[PDB]
Every structure is written in structure tokens, then in C-alpha cells.
Design a protein around this ligand. Structure first.
Ligand SMILES: [Ca+2]
Lengths: 7, 223
């Protein structure tokens, strides 16, 4: 999914 | 970044690290006081770190500046990830120099096949977790909309584009979000999402910055 931590 | 290479200290001067006691997202410096990142990177207590290479060591050239305000696009949809863009205003202007510089906004959109540079301190493993100390780089082409929509049926909006390799092995990944996709010296994309990382037929999906130049300019102008 999203490529932050961890969305 | 999976399957990339070590950029080299300060070779990507517009790259910033969003920090809240640890690195969690990237961003791009567009002028001395504004940074562009992804809307889903939003959180309170953001400290913008410029001039970074090794994010765990103070080596010199770093500038730590608090975010005075974070402006998530009013129409950002957390479900579809449409309008995944955020502007961050710095509490004080950054000192621009050789190691810290802004990147230009595009005047037109990039076409399929255009080669771009993606960078970040995100995970370097597709199966597992391994975060680098230093900034990683990856050269990747923008894919055709038909291939992009074939890979992610019903999930690609006009404000998104795919970039990468269908064969897998090279891609952005967790921790890279909000980072820059620069093609020909222009900021064309923002790292956003993907199904896994560096998976076959599952390229990275990015926010199409050219669709937001007017919004960015009008917003900065009134803030
Ligand atoms: Ca450092």
C-alpha cells in the first residue's frame, strides 16, 4: 500500500 | 529503494527527510521555505532535515528546521489515495547552497519512456526489512498509462502515473513516500504507493505533480 511507515 | 545504488553525499540537494524521532518520509525542497511531500506522510511534530546523507550521523551540511504548517490537499482521499500531495512550510528559510538546493516544478507533464531519478532512505528489501543509513537512488522510466492501468485495474486516477520495471527487482518502497521523482531537472512525481515493492508486474505508483502546479503556486502565494 502506501510507502510510508506503514501507510 | 529496492535495487538502487548509493547516490553519493549531497548529489540530490533537493531531497529532504521528514523526521519525528526517526525518518518516516522523504520530500522535495521547492524554494527556501517550502517542501512538497505526500499527503499520507502528514503528522504533527515534523522536523524537516535538509542536506542529509547518512541519516543516523551528523556529518556536517545538515539543517534541521521545524515545519511551521503542513497543508494536505483539501481533496486528498485516504481510501483511493487520489490527490496525495502535501505542502510543508518551514519555520525559517533554509540556507541554499551547493548541498541544499531547490528543484523546479514542471511546466508540462512527462511522457511515457521519460527517464527519471527516484531517491530515498526507504526499505531496500522486497522480502524483509533493511533500512539504509545513506541516501539511495534509482533511475526509472515513466510507464504508459495502458500498462499502468493493466497492472492496477480501477485504481489509477488521472492524478497518478506508474514508473519502474515490470520485470521487478527495482522500485521505491516503505520509507520512500513523499520523495521526489525528477525527470530532466523537473519534479514530476511524489512517491506514493504500490502493491509490495519491486514485485513482478506491480510498478510503483506516483502522484502526478504536473496536475498540481497551479494549486501549489496559489497556495504558497497565500501562505
Ligand atoms: Ca546526517
Amino acid at each position: 500500500x502506501t510507502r510510508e511507515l506503514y501507510v | 529503494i529496492v535495487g538502487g545504488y548509493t547516490c553519493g553525499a549531497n548529489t540530490v540537494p533537493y531531497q529532504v527527510s521528514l523526521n519525528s524521532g526517526y525518518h518516516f518520509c522523504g520530500g522535495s525542497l521547492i524554494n527556501s521555505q517550502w517542501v512538497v511531500s505526500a499527503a499520507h506522510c502528514y503528522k504533527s511534530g515534523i522536523q524537516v532535515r535538509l542536506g542529509e546523507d547518512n541519516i543516523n550521523v551528523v556529518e556536517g551540511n545538515e539543517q534541521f528546521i521545524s515545519a511551521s504548517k503542513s497543508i494536505v490537499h483539501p481533496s486528498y482521499n485516504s481510501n483511493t489515495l487520489n490527490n496525495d500531495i502535501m505542502l510543508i512550510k518551514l519555520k525559517s528559510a533554509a540556507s541554499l547552497n551547493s548541498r541544499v538546493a531547490s528543484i523546479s516544478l514542471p511546466t508540462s507533464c512527462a511522457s511515457a519512456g521519460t527517464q527519471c531519478l527516484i531517491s530515498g532512505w526507504g526499505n531496500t528489501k522486497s522480502s524483509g526489512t533493511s533500512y539504509p543509513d545513506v541516501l539511495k537512488c534509482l533511475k526509472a522510466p515513466i510507464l504508459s498509462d495502458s500498462s499502468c492501468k493493466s497492472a492496477y485495474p480501477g485504481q489509477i486516477t488521472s492524478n497518478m502515473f506508474c514508473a519502474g520495471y515490470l520485470e521487478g527487482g527495482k522500485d521505491s518502497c516503505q520509507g520512500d513516500s513523499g520523495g521526489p521523482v525528477v525527470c530532466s531537472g523537473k519534479l514530476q512525481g511524489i512517491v506514493s504507493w504500490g502493491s509490495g515493492c519491486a514485485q513482478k508486474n506491480k510498478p510503483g505508483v506516483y502522484t502526478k505533480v504536473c496536475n498540481y502546479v497551479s494549486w501549489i503556486k496559489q497556495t504558497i502565494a497565500s501562505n
